[PDB]
Design a protein around this ligand. Structure first.
Ligand SMILES: *Cc1ccc([N+](=O)[O-])c(OS(C)(=O)=O)c1
Ligand SMILES: *Cc1ccc([N+](=O)[O-])c(OS(C)(=O)=O)c1
Ligand SMILES: [Ca+2]
Ligand SMILES: [Ca+2]
Ligand SMILES: [Cl-]
Ligand SMILES: [Cl-]
Lengths: 9, 230, 230, 9
């Protein structure tokens, strides 16, 4: 189950 | 504040350089310094803050999961537990730092829906990361703190943003993951993901080509979870 | 020594856990603590030390290259140079730490060819990383320190190990890269890579299936460089 | 031009 990756601006 | 002698604009510039160099601990420290200047953050600056800490805590969480798995297998010397505890304490420290920035004083100064929803979503996320490692006495209180932050963000986002707004979509995605993974409420997770996806799809017709791309990207993540959960 | 209160065997155990968790800074600190116990390192422990620091310095080098490239483009505020300098100083500090462990007192206690060649190769590698960022007054002396360490390692390895020995092969590979990238001697790099490859190929018939796999893996890296250089 | 990767024990 994936949350927002959110690792790249 | 170790960043107290650097200009706000220089901290922001260096956070962008640190992202390009994949130096996420540096990025986070630069963005912490920028927040501590006391001014509100722009949309771009909020994204830099979030990206920096998400990478830092993402590395800690991945390491914690590796060590916790080794530890659990060993329970079927003290070193595995000791090292898991060290990583756990470090992770809790980063979450507490983020939560402290949100509490002093990002959230209280955030009056627009976009900023307030963004920060309350972060608050929910960082309590959720604390909940992933929490065991006793305050695990329930940590979970309720995550729930409360996500719920306030959801209430504002439903009143103030269109259903395709990417922050509204990512908030719903992450709250659904909270329901599934933390709160032991898979039906609530599925219902939230389905309703979010359907209301977004019905609103896509209003969007430009670039906004359509932004919204459908996150909608696919909702669909990916629903495929996994059903 | 911040690791001074932890048992040697616990430091080694935790270095292995840190590798599994991809916590390479922790790995390096654990292995530094183990070296500082004062006992010689086994073959496996030498590999742990090398892997830990190679990952740490590899991240720094990649970041330094990103920032140096941005800086050079900007020379076609002070922030890019300032941040490149910070990363550079950090990288130099890690190289100096590794070189200090080799000098106090890993190399002087290493009597067997396998250990002495391993440590002298590391010494050459870490001077090579210093050379990659060095500019003035001591750049020549840094380069000569790398050359001298690699040369002593090569002399021992040619007398004491078969041409297929993986440490002998990796030493030759890295010395050839030194010639190509640092010493501006591409013909020497090519000649070393060719001779190393040919003498290894002629010795493969003596090896078990597992040793054959180990040696041919590194031979392919030599061939990859030769393809790039010719 | 690649040196020994050397990132995995
Ligand atoms: C929480 C969140 C959801 C969606 C997006 N987005 O669409 O980019 C963001 O921004 S970011 C660049 O941090 O992933 C955050
Ligand atoms: C310098 C070097 C060359 C070759 C090898 N090897 O064959 O594994 C090593 O060991 S390691 C596991 O650090 O790459 C080192
Ligand atoms: Ca405000
Ligand atoms: Ca000895
Ligand atoms: Cl100012
Ligand atoms: Cl002891």
């Amino acid at each position: 189950a994936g949350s927002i990756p959110g690792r790249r601006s | 504040g170790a960043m107290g002698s650097m200009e706000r604009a220089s901290l922001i510039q260096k956070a962008k350089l640190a992202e390009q160099a994949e130096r996420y601990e540096d990025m986070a420290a630069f963005m912490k310094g920028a927040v501590e200047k006391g001014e509100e953050l722009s949309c771009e600056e909020r994204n830099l803050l979030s990206v920096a800490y998400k990478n830092v805590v993402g590395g800690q969480r991945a390491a914690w999961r590796v060590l916790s798995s080794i530890e659990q297998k060993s329970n079927e010397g003290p070193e595995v537990r000791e090292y898991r505890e060290k990583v756990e304490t470090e992770l809790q420290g980063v979450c507490d730092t983020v939560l402290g920035l949100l509490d002093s004083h990002l959230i209280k100064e955030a009056g627009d829906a976009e900023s307030r929803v963004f920060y309350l979503k972060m608050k929910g996320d960082y309590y959720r990361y604390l909940a992933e490692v929490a065991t006793g006495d305050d695990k329930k209180r940590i979970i309720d703190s995550a729930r409360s932050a996500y719920q306030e963000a959801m209430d504002i986002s439903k009143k103030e943003m269109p259903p395709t707004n990417p922050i509204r979509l990512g908030l719903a995605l992450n709250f659904s993951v909270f329901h599934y993974e933390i709160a032991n409420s898979p039906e609530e997770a599925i219902s939230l993901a389905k309703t979010t996806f359907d209301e977004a799809m019905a609103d896509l017709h209003t969007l430009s080509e670039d906004s359509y791309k932004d919204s459908t990207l996150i909608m696919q993540l909702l669909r990916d979870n629903l495929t996994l959960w059903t």
